[PDB]
Amino acid sequence: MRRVVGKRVQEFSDAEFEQLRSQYDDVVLDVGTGDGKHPYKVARQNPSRLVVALDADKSRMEKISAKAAAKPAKGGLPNLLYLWATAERLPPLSGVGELHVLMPWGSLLRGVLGSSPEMLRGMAAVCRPGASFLVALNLHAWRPSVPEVGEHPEPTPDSADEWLAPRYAEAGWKLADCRYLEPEEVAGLETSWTRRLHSSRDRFDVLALTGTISP
Template identity: 35%
Template sequence: MAARHAAVHLDFGTGDGAFALRRARSEPSTLVIGVDASAEGLREPSRRAAGKPARGGLGNAMFGVLPLERAPGELIGLVDSLTVLLPWGSLLRAVALPEAEGWRGCAGCASRGVAADRIRLRSRRSAGSASAARIAGGGRAAALVQAYARAGFTVTARATSREEVGSLPTTWAKKLAYSNSEREFVALTGVAR
């Protein structure tokens, strides 16, 4: 008989799965699902989660390939909470602008009232890209709050320090926070209406 979980958490764009594994370990009654567009990074966390509990295996963690373009896929309406930590590419555009079509795919995994409990966005000012330019700027937090409201989410947005980003339990966070590139980070927290 499969274990029942009090909640389902989705880490979208999970990368190497470090955050998902840590969350599963700290919340044993929550099923934590890490998805990413690339299967390569998911092999090791999948192996670790599938191990025997005495060797660090976690029966409440699972990983799968789910590019944003195919979301929500089989996860439609199943998720209680969602994290998107330091996205890039199409996922960054979807959550940073937010790009309606892409964000709908990500948010489509969520049940009504889902908590988007942590979204960390990054921008590189020197990159000169349209995404970076639209993330940066004094009015960006207010613009994000309004854009998410139009998408059916009530969010708060605030600037985040490199130190706070560096403390996130992900490999990617350490690389971004301590690189020499000039970056700005924005944290969003919210809930679907």
């Protein structure tokens, strides 16, 4: 595992991770965390769970990871770990209890559309059976269609129940609910995307897919 703290990366062992995790009730993983504001909120609000967040781009996490590693009085949080990793090559995590993928783009977005099940299966691998998941799709990936969504139509609560659920099941994800999130609900997630989306004139910008990992 490759921990990010400010501009520093430090590899550490699975054994060290296990000792850390063993002190908490459960683990939450944010995949593609970007600037890392969301997991910082999650860790702040959930002191009894260990929050792990990763991104392919280590530079994005510099500021917040440095703050999280500081003393408590300066915004430090003991239950928050930022890692440098892609969704294609996840860290050796096991038994994650809650998985978030918020506003993905690029190969992570292609992955969560499930035309191929490999990425979904790789993410399911780090989770225990019964883990909860939230995939929050940025619908602007279809406004207009970006290269990575190919010919996929923009998903809706109904259409997702139709063509996404079967794909998720093939990959071991039980898609239980699909619904639009109000802009205020998106804002509650505390991602950097709130700012980008503030100027949107669309009714909804995000579709939330939730369920459980069921291999």
